[PDB]
Design a binder for these strands. Structure first.
Ligand SMILES: [Mg+2]
Ligand SMILES: [Mg+2]
Length: 71
RNA sequence: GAAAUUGAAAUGGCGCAAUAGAUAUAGUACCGCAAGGGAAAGACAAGCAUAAUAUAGCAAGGACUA
């Protein structure tokens, strides 16, 4: 849904792209132990087990607790 | 590798500071049958602990919110 148009001199391309709204008809009304724990978490979040095991103090201390923040 | 020949006057350290300077705290201890050999030392390194560990690998780098 974009309108392309060179200008008369042909030196600049003009693109008209209005934002199209979602039609009302295209919408639905609003409705009104360590082992087993890690298996449950992996099933819940569609991950593997390895993510949920802890890490040693060395890794934990290596993690930066005051990371730079942008925007 | 010569000699002939020639004819110099007169308390200190750009030395060390205990692995250095004597081997030297001592020619002792100790070693050797013996001759001999011959030391060491006195005034937050490594290793650990606080705090073991998490898939993958020269152990880092690029990074990354992490
Ligand atoms: Mg000495
Ligand atoms: Mg140390």
């Amino acid at each position: 849904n974009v309108e392309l148009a060179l200008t008369s001199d042909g030196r600049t391309i003009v693109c008209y792209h209005p934002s199209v709204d979602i039609p009302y008809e295209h919408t639905k009304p609003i409705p009104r132990e360590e082992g087993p724990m890690i298996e449950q978490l992996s099933k819940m979040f569609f991950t593997t087990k390895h993510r949920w095991y802890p890490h040693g103090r060395y890794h934990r201390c290596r993690k930066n607790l005051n990371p730079p923040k942008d925007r």
